[PDB]
Design a protein around this ligand. Structure first.
Ligand code: SF4
Ligand code: SF4
Ligand code: FES
Ligand SMILES: [K+]
Ligand SMILES: [Zn+2]
Lengths: 208, 688, 95, 114, 48, 86, 126
């Protein structure tokens, strides 16, 4: 398994497991799950009410010092009743490490904003509200950031179609750019590329 | 309990005795690769792909044929199981041709898929491959035997299910080939299933050849309407054009097979279509016109008619929604002359009770029977999958089959009692040995064909068969939940029409002819312009111009079964719905929408606007038409027996002859099949 | 081997030609309809059949890695030649 | 069944927020008409505002109508400042769009759409 | 090509043509497929 | 104007349809003997309510609920339907 | 109390931005997809899928491509269980129909049945 297989890191896996135990034991009020992946990445899944305390602890603790917020993302998984999974990626320059903090919310429940901890969260969760419709309570200035000014609907949700519901064209009668119901000269062709055979037995789900 | 305990990857599972290693691994969600094993075929065990390792045992076993004993641990992902899989895949791909871009199995090939999943990634073969001479087995199946892997599903299917025994293996060693050894056409009613079960591209569909690729086809699950079995199919389209038809899986109807007419009628579905409303001009020729003109002319002629001056005939490919729309429209003008082309006797109980015009047991209830009597029908061609079920029960359950009628070929051995109805009279009188056999039967089953009821003495035949059924069911050892009387239908629209209250047969029209006739796809030619009065206004509504369209005055283009969501009832009373695959071509519309618009123009608007309100009205007329994929029971056999004993119709001397005696008569039945070039090729192949 | 129509329109090698009453011929008015004058079905018909003395033959299209994947053709039938599925070249056994 | 509120605990404060948003839109409609040089009158703009509020008036969940008030507030702030152009303001009025038939007969005449 | 001439093939153009955009010899797109659905031609004789 | 058809919907196993079942099994033969040209469509269903539809001329329709009835009650209802003709 | 009580049905149709005629006139279908009969693998029949009815596709006048006006033509959603799909369809205001999952019933497989002494299940060849 030498030339064509990715070498495995075990010291980092042990250190990340120990730090996951450390965090999940310091904060039992919000932490629900702690896992470490195959490629040595630590994910801490927490309750949505403890977004501010967990992030402030990870930012300010002497043994954490996660001073950088790299990326803030939402993921749309429609089969869950809390379909939106909000993911914080943090970087610690003191210990040269990275962590992942995950929480959940649905369409109608707001999430506490983390601008008071990290200042990149302003534009990041403004984009999250724009694309997934997740409201962030106690935000300084929450509006749209990437979509059109009159756009209706959140495009990164999975029930939103690839091509939207409206399209723009210039009309000479009103001398203006107008929005009309979408009609495609060629329909986007859907491809069924999924193999009917199981690829990875290690990820096999148990039957009902 | 008799269950034993085995372990799959250390996980305990209780299995029945006689279970194989493959089924035990399937019980926990692990699918061992196969190339020759099929769950509906006998076990051959020659591909050796399923070689799994049992722990504490220095030999891999074939999981498709090895039974499990207690305490066994199966290692589905161990090192030597993977080594065996890689070796067998290498041997399978050693002599395979490099034909993947030019072969129709690409993208849906089992060999490609479990070579990518379980095999190696490169080839050590430094020799030359073999080449096999291609064969000709008919205009339906394209044969390229260089791609064959000698899995022998061909012979097992053709011998155990189709019952033909024409395919075989000739040769020895690497020169062994699969074929018929002579220039013989493997022409059966179940030939395309050998295309379905071939794991490689060795057998392919000739009409489908070189047309599409499997990843780009959109799949729509629908119901076949080509016969009254009610087979579930998947229509695969591509950019709004119907490409091919595959079977769906339904364990109680058509388990994974379909007939050849179902598989190859689509090329006629895309020919000879009606795409625009037509009216007669002043020279008497059908010219194109708009929807408004044709609807206004039909409504204006309908407004002057009242009573028995307007009638309607229903064809063989008509949905329940159009039937109830036409019934409501004609009832708004106070007319009850709604007829079907297929004749059913109304003497006695008639179409009131559902027990005397249904396949009362089940399609899947033939597995539980022990003695089956078929009267005056050829089930091989009227309902091929019903005959497949009878053959399966004959093979595995050791069924006893006897037939009254012409000695046709049924792909199993039966007892030909004769072809006279006096034998039916003699069975109920106890003067026959088969009467004693029926009395000794624990689960008897008497099947009467719909084609035997088309005769002038059909009511007497039905009365005699029901007399036999009620003599057996009341007296002999039948519990009461077992239904003996059965009727096999051959028209997809017949049961839905009989449930909604249509009068079977066109005798009502022939009694008092109307001055305005509606034809809903009635292409059987039962009523022509000679029977009708001198100036009759005939309105035809359908998708194909075959028989009724030249004699019509207004032609209203309808939709086919692949172009609308529709409700169809099969011969056992089960209701099913067909989804929309494509849209009707040109100016053609949905049938009930046409009838509703015609009602709106005439000022007699029906109280439904969308499809769901039409189905609500359908539930109002009969509640079993809106419960899909459910079979409802039908009691009150004694009441129908008591009612049928009143009028004593005299039996005739004519022998019971089915209309479909050979394979030649099977292909061309209705307007869809008659417009198919593939059916013409099949008829030309079987006649030469 | 191009062919013309009663309209005066050239017919492509796939058999396409616009109808006489079709309105879509207006796109070629003042312009031209582009067709390929080299019909591959007529061009591959001029290649002579190759006679070989073996039961099977191998075809790669010529050029090795610059051709099609190598296939093997059986020559057991005497009534017909063996056509390659990729390049369309046909072969005949000498005996 | 207990859920976390957004702004309104029950329906009364939500109705107050709807009332305030309608008052703000009704006040701003003349300035929006004047500043954007629209071809409509003030009455047509106020009728469009009332039409949107009436279209959106069948909801009984406090959180849903809180989100609706929030999105309306974003639209109002988007219009008070000159961030929308004339096309974004006029996109509420479908002038170039063809009139869609509604009865059964015309839909039957024009196509297969139910 | 005075030193290493290209391979001669029978289908290669013997006359090179420049960009014909905006000319009467410009390329006009069209569909190369035939008709999919065949219509029913009514009979030319009266029903009498 | 006049009656055209009668529809009797019922369930095979529900106790609310037991009166309709008893009425069918005891009196349907003589009912059909009395009215040979009248379509009396008996339709079973898995969980439907007992119902009695009656269609008249020009599409007029009437509905009677037979829920939790006895044989005599549905017999009197059928006599009323046969004698009404309106 | 920071937790209010809402006893109404969950409905989010006023927030999704979908036009109303793509809500009230569309029929969602919830089903487990059938196994492709050309293959013996069953990995594609594990998850529930919700899709929509097929609308009109016509031919482009220029190139003959397939043109459509239905934005929901390629919308296929995946759900782990049936109730999640039902709740998602009911939350979004789509009228839906549900088809039950069809599983293959177990068979009785015996290699020794091919060589029976007196039964019809003998194989004529092998
Ligand atoms: S049968 Fe399968 S492996 Fe063989 S050429 Fe066809 S796609 Fe390739
Ligand atoms: S042609 Fe196909 S099904 Fe028949 S034996 Fe060969 S691989 Fe098996
Ligand atoms: S699947 Fe068992 S040997 Fe082929
Ligand atoms: K195949
Ligand atoms: Zn070649």
């Amino acid at each position: 398994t030498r030339p064509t297989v990715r070498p495995r890191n075990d010291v980092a896996h042990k250190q990340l497991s120990a730090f996951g135990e450390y965090v999940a034991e310091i904060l039992p009020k919000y932490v629900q799950q702690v896992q470490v992946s195959c490629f040595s990445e630590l994910e801490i899944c927490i309750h949505p009410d403890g977004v501010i305390p967990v992030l402030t602890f990870l930012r300010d603790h002497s043994n954490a010092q996660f001073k950088s917020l790299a990326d803030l993302t939402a993921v749309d998984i429609p089969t869950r009743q809390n379909r939106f999974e909000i993911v914080y990626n943090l970087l610690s320059l003191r210990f040269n490490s990275r962590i992942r903090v995950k929480t959940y919310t649905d369409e109608l429940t707001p999430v506490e904003s983390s601008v008071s901890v990290y200042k990149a969260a302003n534009w990041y969760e403004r984009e999250i509200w724009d694309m997934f419709g997740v409201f962030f309570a106690n935000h300084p200035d929450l509006r749209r950031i990437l979509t059109d000014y009159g756009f209706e609907g959140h495009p990164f949700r999975k029930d939103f179609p690839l091509s939207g519901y409206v399209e723009l064209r210039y009309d000479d009668e009103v001398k203006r750019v107008v929005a009309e119901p979408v009609e495609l000269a060629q329909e986007f062709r859907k491809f069924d590329l999924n193999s009917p055979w199981e690829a990875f037995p290690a990820y096999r789900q148990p039957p009902e | 309990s008799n269950l034993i305990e085995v372990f799959v990857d250390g996980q305990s599972v209780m299995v029945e005795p006689g279970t194989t290693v493959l089924q035990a691994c399937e019980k926990v969600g692990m699918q061992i690769p196969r190339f020759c094993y099929h769950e509906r075929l006998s076990v051959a065990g020659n591909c050796r792909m399923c070689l799994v390792e049992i722990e504490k045992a220095p030999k891999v076993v074939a999981a498709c044929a090895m039974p499990v004993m207690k305490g066994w641990n199966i290692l589905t992902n161990s090192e030597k199981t993977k080594k065996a899989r890689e070796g067998v895949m290498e041997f399978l791909l050693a002599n395979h041709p490099l034909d993947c871009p030019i072969c129709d199995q690409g993208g849906e090939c089992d060999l490609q898929d479990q070579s990518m999943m379980f095999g190696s990634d490169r080839s050590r073969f430094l020799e030359g491959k073999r080449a096999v001479e291609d064969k000709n087995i008919g205009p339906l199946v394209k044969t390229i035997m260089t791609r064959c892997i000698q899995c022998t599903r061909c012979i097992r299917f053709a011998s155990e299910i189709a019952g033909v025994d024409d395919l075989g293996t000739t040769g020895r060693g690497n020169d062994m080939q699969v074929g018929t050894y002579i220039e013989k056409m493997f022409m059966s009613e179940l030939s395309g299933n050998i295309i379905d079960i071939c794991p490689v591209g060795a057998l392919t569909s000739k009409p489908y050849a070189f047309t599409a690729r499997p990843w780009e086809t959109r799949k729509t699950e629908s119901i076949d309407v080509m016969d009254a079995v009610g087979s579930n199919i998947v229509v695969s389209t591509r950019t709004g054009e119907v490409m091919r038809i595959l079977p769906r899986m339904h364990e109680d109807i058509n388990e994974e097979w379909i007939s050849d007419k179902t598989r190859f009628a689509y090329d006629g579905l895309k020919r000879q279509r009606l795409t625009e409303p037509m009216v007669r001009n002043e020279k008497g020729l059908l010219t194109h016109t708009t929807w408004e003109d044709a609807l206004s002319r039909v409504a204006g002629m309908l407004q002057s008619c009242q009573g028995n001056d307007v009638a309607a005939i229903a064809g063989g490919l008509v949905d329940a929604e159009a039937l109830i729309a036409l019934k409501d429209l004609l009832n708004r003008v106070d007319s009850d002359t709604l007829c079907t082309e297929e004749v059913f006797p109304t003497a006695g109980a008639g179409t009131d009770l559902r027990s005397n015009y249904l396949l009362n047991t089940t399609i899947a209830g033939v597995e539980e029977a022990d003695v089956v009597l078929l009267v005056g029908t050829n089930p091989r061609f009227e309902a091929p999958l019903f005959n497949a079920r009878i053959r399966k029960s004959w093979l595995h359950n050791d069924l006893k089959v006897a037939l009254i009628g012409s000695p046709v070929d049924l792909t199993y051995r039966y007892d030909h009692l004769g072809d006279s109805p006096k034998i039916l009279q003699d069975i109920a009188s106890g003067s026959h040995p088969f009467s004693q056999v029926l009395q000794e039967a624990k689960k008897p089953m008497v099947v009467l064909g719909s084609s035997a009821l088309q005769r002038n003495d059909g009511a007497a035949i039905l009365a005699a068969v029901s007399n036999i059924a009620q003599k057996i069911r009341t007296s002999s050892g039948v519990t009461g939940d077992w239904k003996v009387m059965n009727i096999l239908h051959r028209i997809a629209s017949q049961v839905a029409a009989l449930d909604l209250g249509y009068k079977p047969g066109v005798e009502a029209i022939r009694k008092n002819p109307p001055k305005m006739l509606f034809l809903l796809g009635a292409d059987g030619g039962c009523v022509t312009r000679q029977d009708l009065p001198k100036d009759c206004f005939i309105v035809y509504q359908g998708h194909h111009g075959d028989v009724g369209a030249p004699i019509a005055d207004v032609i209203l283009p309808g939709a086919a079964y692949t172009e609308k969501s529709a409700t169809y009832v099969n011969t056992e009373g089960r209701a099913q719905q067909t989804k929309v695959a494509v849209m009707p071509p040109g100016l053609a519309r949905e049938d009930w929408k046409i009838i509703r618009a015609l009602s709106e123009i005439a000022g007699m608007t029906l109280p439904y606007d969308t499809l769901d309100q039409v189905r609500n009205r359908l539930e109002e007329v009969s509640p079993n038409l809106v419960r899909y994929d459910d079979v409802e029971g039908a009691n009150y056999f004694q009441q129908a027996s008591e009612l049928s004993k009143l009028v004593n119709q005299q039996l005739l001397a004519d022998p019971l002859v089915p209309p479909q005696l050979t394979i030649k008569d099977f292909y061309m039945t209705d307007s869809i099949s008659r417009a198919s070039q593939t059916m013409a090729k099949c008829v030309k192949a079987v006649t030469e | 081997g191009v062919r013309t129509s009663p309209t005066g329109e050239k017919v492509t090698h796939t058999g396409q030609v616009y109808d006489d009453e079709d309105y879509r011929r207006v796109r070629f008015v003042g312009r031209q309809k582009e067709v390929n004058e080299n019909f591959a079905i007529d061009l591959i018909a001029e290649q002579p059949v190759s006679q070989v003395g073996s039961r099977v033959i191998s075809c790669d299209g010529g050029g090795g890695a610059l051709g099609h994947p190598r296939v093997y053709i059986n020559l057991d039938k005497e009534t017909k030649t063996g056509t390659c599925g990729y390049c369309g070249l046909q072969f005949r056994q000498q005996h | 069944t207990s859920v976390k509120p957004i702004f309104s605990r029950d329906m009364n404060e939500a109705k107050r927020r709807v009332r305030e948003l309608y008052r703000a839109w009704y006040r701003e409609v003349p300035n929006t008409v004047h500043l954007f040089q629209l071809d409509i009158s003030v009455k047509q703009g106020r009728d469009k505002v009332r039409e949107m509020f009436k279209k959106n008036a069948h909801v009984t969940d406090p959180r849903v109508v809180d989100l609706l008030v929030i999105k309306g507030k974003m639209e109002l702030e988007e219009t008070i400042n000159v961030w929308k152009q004339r096309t974004h303001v006029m996109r509420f009025f479908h002038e170039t769009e063809a009139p869609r038939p509604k009865d059964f007969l015309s839909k039957f005449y024009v196509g297969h759409d139910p | 090509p005075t030193v290493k001439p290209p391979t001669a093939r029978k289908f290669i153009w013997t006359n090179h043509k420049f960009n014909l955009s905006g000319t009467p010899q410009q390329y006009v797109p069209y569909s190369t497929t035939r008709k999919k659905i065949q219509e029913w031609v009514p009979p030319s004789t009266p029903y009498k | 104007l006049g009656l055209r058809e009668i529809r009797i919907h019922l369930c095979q196993r529900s106790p609310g349809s037991q009166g309709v079942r008893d009425f069918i099994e005891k009196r349907y033969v003589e009912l059909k003997k009395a009215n040979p040209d009248l379509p009396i469509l008996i339709r079973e269903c898995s969980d439907v309510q007992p119902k009695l539809w009656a269609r008249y001329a020009f599409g007029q329709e009437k509905n009677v609920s037979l829920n939790n009835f006895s044989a005599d009650q549905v017999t009197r209802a059928l006599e009323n339907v046969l004698s009404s003709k309106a | 109390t920071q937790l209010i009580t809402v006893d109404e049905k969950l409905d989010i149709t006023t927030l999704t931005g979908v036009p109303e005629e793509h809500i009230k006139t569309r029929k969602a279908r919830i089903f487990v997809p059938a196994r492709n009969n050309m293959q013996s693998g069953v990995n594609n029949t594990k998850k529930w899928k919700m899709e929509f009815d097929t609308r009109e596709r016509w031919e482009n006048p220029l190139m003959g491509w397939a043109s459509t006006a239905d934005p929901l033509s390629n919308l296929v959603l995946t759900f782990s269980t049936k109730e999640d799909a039902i709740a998602f369809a009911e939350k979004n205001g789509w009228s839906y129909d549900v088809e039950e999952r069809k599983v293959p019933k177990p068979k009785s497989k015996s290699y020794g049945a091919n060589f029976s002494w007196n039964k019809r299940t003998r194989v004529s060849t092998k």
